[PDB]
């Protein structure tokens, strides 16, 4: 069947880390050989499994979460972490089973002048729960007055844009990230490797 690991990795446009795109994969023959053997993926980590023995398992469902972030905020994509991305935008659990992949995309996501289309959530009155989204654009009240959906003093907008230019540094450059989460339940296994 060779399910679509190309519409996820090889796509022209990606999402913003506060609106990360999730795709469900089911009833497939999954080839994890292109990934484990490829000089493109700068970051390739795997938690709960060994990356050389992936074609030997059989899960029930797979979830592919895709987004774009800075180059220095990739260490925040892991269990038991802290930061602006791991508390307000995208949070992984602690009993995590899957694999994190990340690669540079300065040629597609950058632009002379600046690409201000990728955004992050900067302000939140609490911390996200694992695998939770928050697309609300309500106004952040940090003072004594109510904001009434109107910006002003100590009433700020929580979604703020990255600044991506080609002449930036490797730490302020864009990186595209795909998180694969395997789900093995009491039901049969519909995602097995090839033979």
């Amino acid at each position, epitope marked *: 069947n060779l399910c679509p690991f190309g519409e996820v990795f090889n796509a*022209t*446009r990606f999402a913003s880390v506060y609106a990360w795109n999730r795709k469900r994969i089911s009833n497939c023959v999954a080839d994890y050989s292109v990934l484990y053997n490829s000089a493109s993926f700068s970051t390739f980590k795997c938690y709960g499994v060994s990356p050389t023995k992936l074609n030997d398992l059989c899960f029930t469902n797979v979830y592919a979460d895709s987004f774009v972030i800075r180059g220095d905020e990739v260490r925040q994509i892991a269990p038991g972490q802290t930061g602006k991305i791991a508390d307000y935008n995208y949070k992984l659990p602690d009993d995590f089973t899957g694999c994190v992949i990340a690669w540079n995309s300065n040629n597609l*996501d*950058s632009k002379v002048g600046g690409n201000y289309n990728y955004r992050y959530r900067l302000f939140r009155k609490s911390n996200l729960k694992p695998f939770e989204r928050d697309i609300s654009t309500e106004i952040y009240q940090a003072g004594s007055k109510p904001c009434n959906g109107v910006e002003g003093f100590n009433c700020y907008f929580p979604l703020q844009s990255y600044g*991506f230019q080609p002449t930036n540094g490797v730490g302020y450059q864009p990186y595209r990230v795909v998180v694969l989460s395997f789900e093995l339940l009491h039901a049969p296994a519909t995602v097995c490797g090839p033979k």
Partner: antibody, heavy 121, light 108 residues
């Protein structure tokens, strides 16, 4: 003025190889922009061929042209190149070099005057 | 490859009249569509991107409309410098495909 200059017209014969060039002037032309090629047959529509990033020398082709042509670049002199090994009579057409304002804006904001290629026996 | 269909193909008109052209995609391209103008002999020129945005150096009679699967281009105050060919291009996904062309004439 910001512009792209292309090599002059060309007359050729089958089998022979060919290489045409486009040079940009009026911006950060040395790199940081995708340079691509667009084909137009006599009295017909426009067909896209490919694009190239001069800095990293990346490249992206179209299926209809993958393998047939080669698209390369040179950042030193800021010049993009289109290359054929074996020509045919079908390769008779107008070719335009184009520039992307990248970063999600993948339209063509700059065009050349066009290089005419004739392939005759 | 998202396939684009233009309509009409040969559309006559007069001076000062209003004209409309349509492009149609086989899929949903939210707002990723540009319009190019091409006259005989000369190279194509950009008019509109984002399907509702104008380029610096263009008049106002040109306007764009649409989103999703059907887009339109309208020219209200037609003038001699507008009789030409028009192409719609999508830039949502690779590969990037144009239309086929919609020529304009001068009735009599």
């Amino acid at each position: 003025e910001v512009q792209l200059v292309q090599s002059g017209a060309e007359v050729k014969k089958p089998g022979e190889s060919l290489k045409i060039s486009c040079k940009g002037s009026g911006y950060s032309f040395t790199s940081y922009y995708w340079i691509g090629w667009v084909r137009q047959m006599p009295g017909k529509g426009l067909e896209w061929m490919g694009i190239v990033y001069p800095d990293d020398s990346d490249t992206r082709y179209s299926p209809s042209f993958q393998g047939q042509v080669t698209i390369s670049a040179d950042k030193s002199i800021s010049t993009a190149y289109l290359q054929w090994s074996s020509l045919k009579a079908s390769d008779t057409a107008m070719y335009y070099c184009v520039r992307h304002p990248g970063g999600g804006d993948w339209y063509f904001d700059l065009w050349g005057r066009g290089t005419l290629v004739t392939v005759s026996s | 490859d998202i396939q684009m269909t233009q309509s009409p193909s040969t559309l006559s008109a007069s001076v000062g009249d209003r004209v409309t052209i349509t492009c149609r995609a086989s899929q949903s391209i939210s707002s990723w569509l540009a319009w190019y103008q091409q006259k005989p002999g000369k190279a194509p020129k950009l008019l509109i991107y984002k399907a509702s945005s104008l380029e610096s150096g263009v008049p106002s009679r040109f306007s764009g409309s649409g989103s999703g699967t059907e887009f339109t281009l309208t020219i209200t105050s037609l003038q001699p410098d507008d009789f030409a060919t028009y192409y719609c291009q999508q830039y949502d996904s690779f590969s990037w495909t144009f239309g086929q062309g919609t020529k304009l004439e001068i009735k009599r």
